[PDB]
Amino acid sequence: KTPEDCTGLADIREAIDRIDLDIVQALGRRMDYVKAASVAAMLPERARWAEENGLDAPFVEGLFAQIIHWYTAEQIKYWRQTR
Amino acid sequence: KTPEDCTGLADIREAIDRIDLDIVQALGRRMDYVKAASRFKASEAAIPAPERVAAMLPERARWAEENGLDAPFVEGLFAQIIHWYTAEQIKYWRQTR
Ligand SMILES: [Ca+2]
CATH class of the missing domain: 1.20.59.10 (Chorismate mutase)
Structure with a gap:
């Protein structure tokens, strides 16, 4: 859900966990490139x-x-x- | 390009920019959610829930x-x-x- 369509903290946490995993995954890929260099x-x-x-x-x-x-x-x- | 498919440092440096920009953009979206969550808090002191x-x-x-x-x-x-x-x-x- 969008920030606006969040009905409570449970909705908020669903989104934040996804963003934070995206960030960790991007950081993982970032290391693969650094190693490739x-x-x-x-x-x-x-x-x-x-x-x-x-x-x-x-x-x-x-x-x-x-x-x-x-x-x-x-x-x-x-x-x-x-x- | 994937790390294996990168031909030189230029490819890697630009990919890292794109990844770093992705993280900033994600961090920007994260702030929107955090600000929206404030509606569900009865008090400043419950920011944040320590167990969360x-x-x-x-x-x-x-x-x-x-x-x-x-x-x-x-x-x-x-x-x-x-x-x-x-x-x-x-x-x-x-x-x-
Ligand atoms: Ca660039």
């Missing part, structure tokens, strides 16, 4: 997307700095593991 | 492990999301109710 330029882009989507840019930049650094460190681990 | 959050976190962590990702990191990431959205829900609840 084996911040200052990436964050302004993502801060713009945040604003465009009605979200606080600096919070969303915090989320992406966290992500990008994790995936960078994992790429380094993965490289050593596979060479 | 307590069951949400291991579930996302478990999803992470099932998708090739580190549970502690992804659980921490969702802790931050849920926490910030809680604050945003509270602002919205106060403004409207």
Whole structure:
């Protein structure tokens, strides 16, 4: 259901669980690409997307700095593991 | 293109942009739901239900492990999301109710 058609917290939770799983799945696919490849330029882009989507840019930049650094460190681990 | 079908770094960097934009857009839709949920709360202090959050976190962590990702990191990431959205829900609840 849309946010407007939600009749209670149970409807809300159905939608939020789906969004959050979508996010985790996208993050999983994101790692496959990073592995296949084996911040200052990436964050302004993502801060713009945040604003465009009605979200606080600096919070969303915090989320992406966290992500990008994790995936960078994992790429380094993965490289050593596979060479 | 799939990761295997990618011919160089350019393909991968653009796919990552599209995935990252998908996540932002999903996070934008998530905020709409969180703000709509405020209608179903009798008080600012019931934002959030502590047992809801307590069951949400291991579930996302478990999803992470099932998708090739580190549970502690992804659980921490969702802790931050849920926490910030809680604050945003509270602002919205106060403004409207
Ligand atoms: Ca791009």
